[PDB]
């Protein structure tokens, strides 16, 4: 479980304060992105009218700081659930970057921040139910999740809230929530979660690459038959994109994706019969095919 | 929530460089006008098998050492060897040098590793110094010179530089003075470590974490003395718990209202009976690479 180095993102974190409400923002070029609920009072958060709340706001009500150095706001706008604050200085540490929306099952690093200061970095997976099992306390909103490909930071998550069950929910960098949630201090519940099949399969491939292959059988299956059985075990169905991203591991091992699926199916139907895989009786579902290839 | 969390690695990323000698390439740490790297970068194929490092080193010149920081070569103007690390004096100071210190950690302590290849950061993860002085890392060919570290305030405490992988797949290395953790040597020979044990005070800290996060099926009403717990612990190849350890757990005991020795009673029941298919914080094994401080910080 390995995070991306966080330095390129650390160089982009700032704090944003309205009155006494402070959270984190992301400073890229001359724009700071943050959760729109920074403009909320305690009682505004019960059920906020964000449009009305923002109409009462001016550039001069937003305190943006990098460290203790203030950054002057020269314009503001709301895009879905994120506030965009134009500032008078371009971040000299701006990396090459992209905003992306990730699929359930994908992993990303989270730079957990408080008051604009990074406290830690960890690797997360987006669950099928569009929550993440984060580690976030009060003041963490506006922390971001990201991948780094080559030199380019792909920003995929901004943190907004904790659900009753202790899991976390947020948006992409365009302010669109992952999943059915809304930024209201109201009662909300994640759907029942399911196992990320594509990742379990990646894990089995990883086990084969390391010589652990007792679970391979001489059978195969159709993708549709597999998907129908998997759902009976609370496993996600596979998509064509999943079959494709397993390509490199399939090529590396010589084991066809649908043969590995027949192997997983047999594991689901017969259990582990007491044996282990990569030193464990549980199947891991938070390593993507990309993650396996990275560490191998 | 709960997650294995690493320190942010920006301060260390700004110190990593590539070092090359012959056909050997690994990573170096550039602080002020010195680059630190594992000394076996001066070795060849033949050499690694049984190197006489002082002999190999006196036969080198400054210009046998190629240091690259990004696209930019740094010129080496001096070199010395301190135990198993080589110190390269360069004609340029690193402007990104953080406040730092060199520390030797104790077994059971945790630190973050910034894994690097050819002088470029690739990933960060949390490790602990095992009781047998190995670390269960993720290091591939080319990762030597990668460092482990803790951050307090704005200060980076470097505690580990990476040198090798043992046949079992665990890893070994040195502090930044070049002294190995454990009975290992920087020679290309198969080496075994002593028998490992589980870091008990960290297992307890992680059980407290599981209670803070509302996961508590393993608690019980039993109790135990410190010495009667340590007897069972040692039987199962767990480290003894000291009174200092009990004290260190105080804040976590206070937060949860579970006295340390009651948590020891829970752990004792888990050791003797096991988990019977159950899981704590999502694990089917007792985790021992979270310290009390790691739990407090994050919760
Ligand atoms: C923004 O920092 C904050 C992060 C929450 C707080 C504790 N852990 C988190 O992940 N977000 C909120 O407080 C959010 C605001 C709404 C307008 C969306 N409401 C929320 O998360 O309520 C749940 C909660 C649980 C425990 C403590 C505080 C809040
Ligand atoms: C330095 O980058 C390298 C790191 C090893 C290579 C594989 N994983 C690692 O962590 N260290 C060595 O190659 C070391 C050099 C001696 C002179 C100390 N030898 C070593 O670790 O041998 C084991 C090995 C296993 C798998 C591939 C290559 C080497």
Numbering used by the authors:
A (entry chain B): 5 to 300
B (entry chain A): 2 to 300
Pull text from the paper.
The SARS-CoV-2 genome encodes two polyproteins which are processed by a 3C-like protease (3CLpro) and a papain-like protease. Therefore, we generated three deuterated variants of GC376 by replacing hydrogen with deuterium at the metabolic soft spots encompassed in the R-site (aromatic ring and benzylic carbon) and evaluated their activity in the enzyme- and the cell-based assays.
Compound 2 with a bisulfite adduct warhead and compound 5 with α-ketoamide were cocrystallized with the 3CLpro of SARS-CoV-2 and SARS-CoV and examined by X-ray crystallography. Interestingly, the electron density was most consistent with the S-enantiomer at the newly formed stereocenter. Compound 2 adopts the same binding mode in each subunit and forms identical hydrogen bond interactions with residues Phe140, His163, His164, Glu166, and Gln189. Notably, the hydroxyl in compound 2 bound to SARS-CoV-2 3CLpro is 3.38 Å and 3.39 Å from the N-atom of Ser144, which would be a weak hydrogen bond contact. Crystal structures of deuterated GC376 (compound 2) and the 3CLpro of SARS-CoV-2 revealed that deuteration did not alter the interactions between GC376 and 3CLpro which are reported by other groups. It may be speculated that the enhanced activity of the deuterated compounds can be attributed to tighter binding to the target, which was observed with other deuterated compounds, or improved physicochemical properties of the compound. The 50% effective concentration (EC50) values of the tested deuterated compounds (compounds 1, 2, 6, and 7) (0.068 to 0.086 µM) were comparable in those cell lines and lower than GC376 by 2.67∼3.38-fold in Vero E6 cells.
